[model samples]
Target: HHVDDDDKIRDISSKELIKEMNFGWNLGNTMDAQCIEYLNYEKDQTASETCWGNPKTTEDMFKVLIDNQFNVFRIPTTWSGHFGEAPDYKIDEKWLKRVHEVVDYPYKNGAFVILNLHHETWNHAFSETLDTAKEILEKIWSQIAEEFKDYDEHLIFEGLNEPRKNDTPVEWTGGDQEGWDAVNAMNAVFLKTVRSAGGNNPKRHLMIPPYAAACNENSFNNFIFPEDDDKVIASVHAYAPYNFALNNGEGAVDKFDAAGKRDLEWNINLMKKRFVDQGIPMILGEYGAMNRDNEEDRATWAEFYMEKVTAMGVPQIWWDNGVFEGTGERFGLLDRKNLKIVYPTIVAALQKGRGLEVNVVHAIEK
Candidate 1:
């Protein structure tokens, strides 16, 4: 299939791009899946995409999303273990091709696609690891930029996902000064590398996240907007109302109450005051309440979350890992195997929140 010509697409500001986007959906836990144990035993690069239990992504999957009013698609991908050693750090050709194929699934359908580096734990945000991390990021993004250099504005590149030190007390608590500084440096490296790669990349819209993509004051205070702020967007992830949204422990609640609404409002307001209101475009790269067998409550949370964020001109993308059952953060909404939306009510709520007319009749099980 022929890709859209970049020459015909005029350069637009990141703010305009954000306004053009509606709601988005994540192809999560698929291309980004990395199992050290599975890779060690199998040694098959393609096998890793499905090692996390979700089936292979298909073109029909994207069709279904667009049919349901999801105009933006975020393809979260991990590349640390998929590439070779230093100096080169070449990504596997087959793996890259597969990613390109999945990306095309949405791009060919005229939907915006976000290609990001996800779950690359090795890229730590600490002063000590700064040098090595910068080197690796430059290499990876250089190759990526060159590969898709001709693509139009519909294709966006996100530098990193949740860059932070794992297994630490301060890992998720807005990180430290050193961590924030390192992430800011890395963001600059990503912006510089992509802009200098030639082709449409020079004007291509790019996204950079604060440490852990946290929605706190410190993360926003220290976030250094790239020199080309007009072409860059801030990426953040917030699973709000900790107890109802993400905390899957014994005390986790299943109801979306007043406290939950306040939690969601606070985060959305903070993002607006810090970035959007300042003219720096932002995208909620990931947000969803895990299924606690309370679809009604989740539906309420989804509508409130989408409406608040959309009002701020920030498009929200739901994180669907495609795991609806068993012990885990069940964020699945799409049934990849059957190519259907298992939680149509939640999807309808999202559309309603966005001020779109809800055709609940057609949203029923197929």
Candidate 2:
């Protein structure tokens, strides 16, 4: 939603608003980390904020990101640890203020910002019926909506992140039909609460993830677009060809060959048919081909990934935790200490890929 040229405030439908965001970056492994032991769950704001092994967010970080052709920034924030008791579920004031500081860093710089409640229900940490969780969810969103009600359309709200049955074996694979129902129910609450908050919220573009936010055929096929909301965007996470993108130096396809290209195209086309072609803009909330020694192949993959997704108008946010190595998921693209581009070649490839969309368009015509 944006203010009209005639000085009137008008909310644009989500599908109608074509955001010029070719690439996105995730402010991950920072604000969303949670830690609670001695202090109350909702208290101890500092304990939760700094639990994750990452440096404090800085204004210069946004400067570097935008300077590098990134126009969309996704912030994953876990609010469960900082919530008060039921009925109200008030968030810690200090924690809320700190989050605003980080959000303002990118939003003020004119980048599209997305703030969401991450790792809450997705981890099965706070399982409650619609009646119980609704109060907590609405309270949290109402406060958030009120805080930035006057802001421009650049700011967006995401309801959840990969929501699923945490204890279940198939947590990431969209779970069962019962689990799917629960996710849709939560999505409904998310839509209703923000709109109820009034002001610019009623028209702001909101994002909702399907079961587990999986991008596979099973998850995407069963995705039920919520009722009566065209201003919503489908949020999904995909690290395709897991052997190359998520593994730690094991079984990596060291080349962007025909197999890899086919995999990428199939995944992209599935999402396009399921969401984008239907006028529901799809946001690749998280996607990356992990960093390994195969820099040459990784660069090729990045080039192709950016080009295909951009041509379909899907904005993808790369997940970076500032990690460069180790056994964990080391998808870091930026250095935490210096805020410099760690993979200059890969960064250049992404920029180059985004600009190469015309090449694809011409080839299709031929």
Candidate 3:
């Protein structure tokens, strides 16, 4: 509840601010889990957090990640089922407080925390939904900004996560001009709403993404940065070398080879030329290679990805969905309940990749 001292929080640009930030980890499939039909939001507010199979998040989770040199924590939350009807779209008090409690886990530990709206179906990037979307954006962001007014620079606000027209041909494949314009308009609403809240919100570092947060040239070419705000940062999600990192079908590979490395570099190089070189800070809001019974290969991929991103001054947040021994996207790194690193080799490789010395002992073994 106390504001950080003035000396501790200077009026630095987002680019300067990113220089101090190290690797980041996403608290995925937990707060962002939405099960409106099955879960009773009114009766039990915190039920949805664990509805997706992740345990209730605790402070020790942050401690584990921070101990592994992760300084930025991205808390993805879905507020669709927790808000009331129309006009104000008031967020449930209990839900908002719960989010605040989770955010404090990282913020109180002197680490950066990113809070954002995730998996909200109504937030579509289409012309017909533009007005309604802006209204919701304005209302939702105003409440969030007001609630977090006293928080210092350690807290960052990300407007949306992968906002786009769902289930379309171009949904994930760098959207068209119309989708790009709609996303840009919604971003404007977000920036204006937060800045008007009148607190540390004005200078608060805000992250805005292109359509679908796609890490492609078309998305980057069309992304419109706010000319007025110096505190804005660009956000994009890249599960690069799709066959190796994200593809789950028979085509998916188990090796991080030359082709995979080239694919990874292409995306990072594009990001550097489009954003970093232009003096705008960029963050990979979500990134990771799902486990394919290839822990050794995954570790190699982790180091290469981190090393390349670090060289371009872009920080990445690995998506950990709290799933390990499944045929699905097993990105779980930290065992939340036990507060232990499940894959110490991959964690250490990430540190080594980021140009940091691997001095800490990750005692937990897989």
Candidate 4:
């Protein structure tokens, strides 16, 4: 896919920019997962992206997104394993170009593309040993910003994917003041470094994730916003109706009871009050109720869930891993081989959630 330069791009408020984003979908578990060995585990070395069972990401996959009225594509990518030794942390040019190619697919179809640094658990984004982590982060973002500097307004840069420390008990809960302070400092570095990169970056929309990118009230409370720029988005992820969405039989109620609505609304309302109402735009960067046997119940959950989010003025991206039945979480949606809708009910519910005309169009038809 050839890139289209946005010669007529204008600086828009984050709110206005998000309005253009519409619905979103994550090319999850592919670029985000560290599959170094699998990069060669394929016939043509295509398993790098397909190591998670997703086919080598093709233009048609994104075409599937555009055809379904999805207006934003968030590609979570990991670069730590792909980067060269210290002093430079130079990313493999081939891997970088491949990511660029995938990003182009969505942008070509007018969808907002958010590319972010994902899954660097090996280095721990905001650990006690801070200098090394920050250095690597700055180096990585510097390279990323330089590469996509010429992209149009549709191309966005997200600071991190679920930034956090690994072994701590408070890893997901924002830890202590020290931990929260570290994350805030890291967020500051992200803004400063990207802005220093020049070109459209100064005005480019950048997303900063709270501790672990969790949307809980506690996470938001500990979050510190960057001062220098208003063109930033608050990144958070949630699979609402949690018990039903992730009913792994771990004591969570496996039913989408009335409490489900209450639980979800509480979460969304918290975000609206803390971010949107304050004019600080936020994106539910990731959200979706996973399929869990009860098809009718899941559809009910999707419609109600979608209507609530759309009403709240918050946009979301469905996390699809392309797995239907497996031991792991099967958030699969599009059929990779044929690039078609594999789950009609879920897709329509999502389409309806975004207020897109709910039509059951088979993948082959498109």
lDDT of 4: 0.78
Candidate maximizing TM-score: 3
Clashing pairs for model 3 are: none
Q: Which of the two candidates, 1 or 3, achieves a greater TM-score against the reference?
A: 3
Q: Estimate, for each residue in 126-231, the C-alpha lDDT of model 3 and write its tens digit.
A: 8898898999999999999999987888899999888887888989889998899999999989988988887788778999999899999888899999886779
Count of residue pairs whose backbone atoms collide, per candidate: 0, 0, 0, 0
Cα lDDT tens digits, model 1, 1-366, are 278554655579998877778799999998999886647622676777898999989999888888888989999998867888889899988889999999999999999999999989668887777898999999999999999998889999999999976778778888888888988999999999999997889889999999999998888888888664688999999999778998978768999999889877888889989997887888999988888889899988888888888777889899999988887889998888877788888989998999888753324364
Q: What's the lDDT for residue 238 in model 3?
A: 93
Candidate 3's TM-score = 0.96
Superposition error at 39 for model 3 (Å): 0.9
Best by lDDT: 3
Each prediction's TM-score versus the true structure: 0.95, 0.89, 0.96, 0.92
Alpha-carbon deviation at 308 in model 1, angstroms: 0.9
Error of 1 at 36 (Å): 2.8
Task: Report clash pairs, candidate 2.
Answer: none
lDDT of each structure? 0.87, 0.77, 0.89, 0.78
For candidate 1, the 10 contiguous residues with the lowest summed lDDT are 357-366
lDDT of 2 by residue, 179-231 (tens): 67777777788888988776778778889888889887767776778667767
Off by over 4 Å in 4: 1-6, 37-47, 122-127, 363-366
